[PDB]
Enzyme design. Structure first.
Site, PDB file in Angstrom:
ATOM      1  N   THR A  25      -0.718  13.699  10.057  1.00 37.93           N
ATOM      2  CA  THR A  25      -0.547  14.315  11.362  1.00 37.93           C
ATOM      3  C   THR A  25       0.269  15.611  11.266  1.00 37.93           C
ATOM      4  O   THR A  25       1.401  15.553  10.805  1.00 37.93           O
ATOM      5  CB  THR A  25       0.156  13.276  12.325  1.00 37.93           C
ATOM      6  OG1 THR A  25      -0.846  12.331  12.715  1.00 37.93           O
ATOM      7  CG2 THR A  25       0.513  13.897  13.663  1.00 37.93           C
ATOM      8  N   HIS A 175      -8.064   4.067  12.175  1.00 34.01           N
ATOM      9  CA  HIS A 175      -6.607   4.047  11.996  1.00 34.01           C
ATOM     10  C   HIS A 175      -6.047   2.785  12.578  1.00 34.01           C
ATOM     11  O   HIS A 175      -5.616   2.796  13.756  1.00 34.01           O
ATOM     12  CB  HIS A 175      -5.983   5.234  12.656  1.00 34.01           C
ATOM     13  CG  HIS A 175      -4.523   5.404  12.355  1.00 34.01           C
ATOM     14  ND1 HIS A 175      -3.746   4.409  11.791  1.00 34.01           N
ATOM     15  CD2 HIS A 175      -3.712   6.474  12.507  1.00 34.01           C
ATOM     16  CE1 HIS A 175      -2.518   4.865  11.610  1.00 34.01           C
ATOM     17  NE2 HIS A 175      -2.472   6.120  12.021  1.00 34.01           N
ATOM     18  N   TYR A 180       0.071   1.914  16.054  1.00 33.21           N
ATOM     19  CA  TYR A 180      -0.800   2.546  17.043  1.00 33.21           C
ATOM     20  C   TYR A 180      -1.718   1.465  17.610  1.00 33.21           C
ATOM     21  O   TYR A 180      -1.487   0.279  17.355  1.00 33.21           O
ATOM     22  CB  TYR A 180      -1.505   3.809  16.509  1.00 33.21           C
ATOM     23  CG  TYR A 180      -0.439   4.807  16.099  1.00 33.21           C
ATOM     24  CD1 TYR A 180       0.415   5.321  17.069  1.00 33.21           C
ATOM     25  CD2 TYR A 180      -0.264   5.189  14.785  1.00 33.21           C
ATOM     26  CE1 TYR A 180       1.409   6.156  16.770  1.00 33.21           C
ATOM     27  CE2 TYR A 180       0.801   6.086  14.431  1.00 33.21           C
ATOM     28  CZ  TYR A 180       1.586   6.569  15.454  1.00 33.21           C
ATOM     29  OH  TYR A 180       2.619   7.407  15.268  1.00 33.21           O
ATOM     30  N   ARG A 227      -7.647   1.709   7.630  1.00 34.11           N
ATOM     31  CA  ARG A 227      -6.285   1.759   7.139  1.00 34.11           C
ATOM     32  C   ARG A 227      -5.510   0.679   7.908  1.00 34.11           C
ATOM     33  O   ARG A 227      -5.516   0.660   9.107  1.00 34.11           O
ATOM     34  CB  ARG A 227      -5.632   3.123   7.410  1.00 34.11           C
ATOM     35  CG  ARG A 227      -4.600   3.428   6.331  1.00 34.11           C
ATOM     36  CD  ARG A 227      -3.837   4.745   6.477  1.00 34.11           C
ATOM     37  NE  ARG A 227      -3.282   5.132   5.186  1.00 34.11           N
ATOM     38  CZ  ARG A 227      -2.261   5.971   5.060  1.00 34.11           C
ATOM     39  NH1 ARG A 227      -1.673   6.468   6.139  1.00 34.11           N
ATOM     40  NH2 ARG A 227      -1.817   6.304   3.869  1.00 34.11           N
ATOM     41  N   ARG A 267       8.124  -2.486   1.348  1.00 37.49           N
ATOM     42  CA  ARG A 267       9.356  -1.887   0.777  1.00 37.49           C
ATOM     43  C   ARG A 267       9.450  -2.022  -0.780  1.00 37.49           C
ATOM     44  O   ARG A 267      10.384  -2.620  -1.348  1.00 37.49           O
ATOM     45  CB  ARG A 267      10.599  -2.443   1.489  1.00 37.49           C
ATOM     46  CG  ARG A 267      10.364  -2.858   3.000  1.00 37.49           C
ATOM     47  CD  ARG A 267      11.378  -2.244   4.040  1.00 37.49           C
ATOM     48  NE  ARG A 267      11.998  -0.985   3.576  1.00 37.49           N
ATOM     49  CZ  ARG A 267      13.220  -0.550   3.908  1.00 37.49           C
ATOM     50  NH1 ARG A 267      13.992  -1.254   4.731  1.00 37.49           N
ATOM     51  NH2 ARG A 267      13.669   0.600   3.409  1.00 37.49           N
ATOM     52  N   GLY A 286       1.836   4.955  -0.221  1.00 37.14           N
ATOM     53  CA  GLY A 286       3.198   4.743   0.221  1.00 37.14           C
ATOM     54  C   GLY A 286       4.153   4.834  -0.947  1.00 37.14           C
ATOM     55  O   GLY A 286       4.298   3.881  -1.710  1.00 37.14           O
ATOM     56  N   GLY A 287       4.807   5.980  -1.059  1.00 36.75           N
ATOM     57  CA  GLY A 287       5.807   6.177  -2.072  1.00 36.75           C
ATOM     58  C   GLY A 287       5.302   6.182  -3.488  1.00 36.75           C
ATOM     59  O   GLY A 287       6.149   6.003  -4.357  1.00 36.75           O
ATOM     60  N   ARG A 309       3.022  13.066   1.296  1.00 34.30           N
ATOM     61  CA  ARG A 309       3.994  14.165   1.210  1.00 34.30           C
ATOM     62  C   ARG A 309       3.835  15.128   0.044  1.00 34.30           C
ATOM     63  O   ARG A 309       3.927  16.361   0.223  1.00 34.30           O
ATOM     64  CB  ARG A 309       5.394  13.570   1.222  1.00 34.30           C
ATOM     65  CG  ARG A 309       5.832  13.147   2.619  1.00 34.30           C
ATOM     66  CD  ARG A 309       7.091  12.310   2.563  1.00 34.30           C
ATOM     67  NE  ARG A 309       6.800  11.018   1.939  1.00 34.30           N
ATOM     68  CZ  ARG A 309       7.753  10.187   1.572  1.00 34.30           C
ATOM     69  NH1 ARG A 309       9.017  10.561   1.838  1.00 34.30           N
ATOM     70  NH2 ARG A 309       7.465   8.990   0.993  1.00 34.30           N
TER      71      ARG A 309
HETATM   72  C1  FMN Z   1       3.945  14.432   8.126  1.00 33.35           C
HETATM   73  C2  FMN Z   1       3.399  13.019   8.142  1.00 33.35           C
HETATM   74  C3  FMN Z   1       2.270  12.747   8.904  1.00 33.35           C
HETATM   75  C4  FMN Z   1       1.537  11.570   8.767  1.00 33.35           C
HETATM   76  N1  FMN Z   1       0.417  11.308   9.621  1.00 33.35           N
HETATM   77  C5  FMN Z   1      -0.315  10.132   9.431  1.00 33.35           C
HETATM   78  C6  FMN Z   1      -1.475   9.921  10.167  1.00 33.35           C
HETATM   79  O1  FMN Z   1      -2.063  10.860  10.790  1.00 33.35           O
HETATM   80  N2  FMN Z   1      -2.192   8.787   9.918  1.00 33.35           N
HETATM   81  C7  FMN Z   1      -1.794   7.868   9.002  1.00 33.35           C
HETATM   82  O2  FMN Z   1      -2.494   6.869   8.836  1.00 33.35           O
HETATM   83  N3  FMN Z   1      -0.683   8.081   8.234  1.00 33.35           N
HETATM   84  C8  FMN Z   1       0.070   9.225   8.448  1.00 33.35           C
HETATM   85  N4  FMN Z   1       1.152   9.486   7.599  1.00 33.35           N
HETATM   86  C9  FMN Z   1       1.430   8.560   6.433  1.00 33.35           C
HETATM   87  C10 FMN Z   1       0.803   9.065   5.123  1.00 33.35           C
HETATM   88  O3  FMN Z   1      -0.603   9.070   5.243  1.00 33.35           O
HETATM   89  C11 FMN Z   1       1.328   8.212   3.913  1.00 33.35           C
HETATM   90  O4  FMN Z   1       1.013   6.822   4.029  1.00 33.35           O
HETATM   91  C12 FMN Z   1       2.881   8.328   3.763  1.00 33.35           C
HETATM   92  O5  FMN Z   1       3.319   9.701   3.784  1.00 33.35           O
HETATM   93  C13 FMN Z   1       3.455   7.584   2.538  1.00 33.35           C
HETATM   94  O6  FMN Z   1       2.794   8.203   1.469  1.00 33.35           O
HETATM   95  P1  FMN Z   1       3.681   9.275   0.559  1.00 33.35           P
HETATM   96  O7  FMN Z   1       4.769   8.568  -0.049  1.00 33.35           O
HETATM   97  O8  FMN Z   1       2.655   9.807  -0.401  1.00 33.35           O
HETATM   98  O9  FMN Z   1       4.135  10.426   1.444  1.00 33.35           O
HETATM   99  C14 FMN Z   1       1.941  10.639   7.792  1.00 33.35           C
HETATM  100  C15 FMN Z   1       3.058  10.891   7.005  1.00 33.35           C
HETATM  101  C16 FMN Z   1       3.771  12.092   7.166  1.00 33.35           C
HETATM  102  C17 FMN Z   1       4.829  12.492   6.164  1.00 33.35           C
END
Ligand code: FMN
EC number: 1.3.1.42
Length: 351
Positions: A25, A175, A180, A227, A267, A286-287, A309
């Protein structure tokens, strides 16, 4: 050589590598309209054979709970998404549109006629939080949906799936995570309905399964992912029995023979039961670090890994990973700001 950078066949799509752009997002689709800047953004993150998921995209006029997140429910939204999709296709991406409805994660200021956000229940979200000054909840307590209104929201997702195809997306990601609207029905701390959409695990999954049903009938199950985050509690969405929710969902989506199940890690027992239960492609998120993902791939714990990220901050993430180059730092204060360029398309490629 590098497990993340090994090709993988996702049903009928050939992916060159397993480094997926997570849905992110970014709140820069002014007025809910996709903008030409998104064409640069997703283009920069495309590789031939790379898999990209869009930011969450609204299914209807009431699916929004943040400013400037895109829809795909009007002919207008369709037409604006076409050049974004085409730019991804030009560089050989497989590109799925993630479709959501925020449900209770919203306010009257985001709803048509200023009406209440809608949800499976009337349970208020973060009641301790008000907007600057007014004693008025930031999250406008939601209206409990009449059962006569539920088929015409499940149809809202069917139709967004249809419009994704019109815009030329390769597929759709439902989603069903992160607190949500779909997750609201699934989670026992949120869903206290005493009709057929509530009051039991099966009743609670009726909604998501109906949605999967209608989307996959619309566009083909082979172009459909979902998801889930059964372990998370973002926006007061925790489940008292998250392992059961997770297993029942993964098991239950087998019937439908959809393309993928994409799950966010807790976690860190958790993702494995779902993975062994679900016969199609599995995407973990996730992470993850590079090394976490290399390892998950090589040990068969997942097929693909979505990076959010790091990919946000590194348009050439997959290449960087192929080589173990250093990554750009991600600038959190510009994740959600509204500039077409700043902290959006100005993260640099490798010199
Ligand atoms: C800026 C931001 C926006 C995100 N928007 C969504 C979203 O639109 N839909 C969704 O399913 N997850 C969203 N996420 C979650 C990511 O898709 C992902 O699961 C999360 O960042 C953990 O992964 P990472 O460690 O690679 O960042 C968002 C995360 C961040 C940081």
């Amino acid at each position: 050589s590098v497990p993340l950078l090994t090709p993988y066949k996702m049903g009928r799509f050939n992916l060159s590598h397993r480094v997926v752009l997570a849905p992110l997002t970014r709140q820069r689709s002014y007025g809910n309209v996709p903008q030409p800047h998104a064409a640069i953004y997703y283009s920069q993150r495309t590789t031939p054979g790379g898999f990209l998921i869009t930011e969450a995209t609204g299914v209807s006029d009431t699916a929004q709970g943040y400013q400037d997140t895109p829809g795909i429910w009007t002919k207008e939204h369709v037409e604006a998404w076409k050049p974004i999709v085409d730019a991804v296709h030009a560089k050989g991406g497989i590109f799925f549109c993630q479709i959501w409805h925020v449900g209770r994660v919203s306010n009257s200021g985001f709803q048509p006629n200023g009406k209440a956000p809608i949800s499976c229940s009337d349970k208020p979200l973060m009641p301790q939080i008000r907007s600057n000054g007014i004693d008025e909840a930031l999250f406008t307590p939601p209206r409990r949906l009449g059962i006569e209104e539920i088929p015409g929201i499940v149809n809202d997702f069917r139709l967004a799936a249809r419009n994704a195809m019109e815009a030329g997306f390769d597929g759709v990601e439902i989603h069903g995570a992160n607190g949500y609207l779909i997750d609201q029905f699934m989670k026992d701390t949120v869903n206290d309905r005493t009709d057929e959409y509530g009051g039991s695990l099966q009743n609670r999954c009726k909604f998501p399964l109906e949605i999967v049903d209608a989307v996959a009938k619309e566009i083909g199950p082979d172009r459909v992912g979902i998801r889930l985050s059964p372990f998370a509690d973002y926006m007061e969405s925790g489940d008292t029995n998250p392992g059961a929710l997770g297993l029942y969902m993964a098991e239950s989506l087998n019937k439908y023979g959809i393309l993928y199940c994409h799950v966010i890690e807790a976690r860190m027992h958790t993702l494995m039961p779902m993975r062994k239960a679900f016969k199609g492609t599995f995407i973990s998120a996730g992470g993850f670090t590079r090394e976490d993902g290399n390892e998950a791939v090589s040990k068969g714990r997942t097929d693909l890994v979505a990076y959010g990220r790091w990919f946000l901050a590194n348009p050439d993430l997959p290449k960087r990973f192929q080589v173990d180059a250093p990554l750009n730092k991600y600038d959190r204060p510009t994740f959600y700001t509204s500039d077409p360029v700043v902290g959006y398309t100005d993260y640099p490629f490798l010199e």
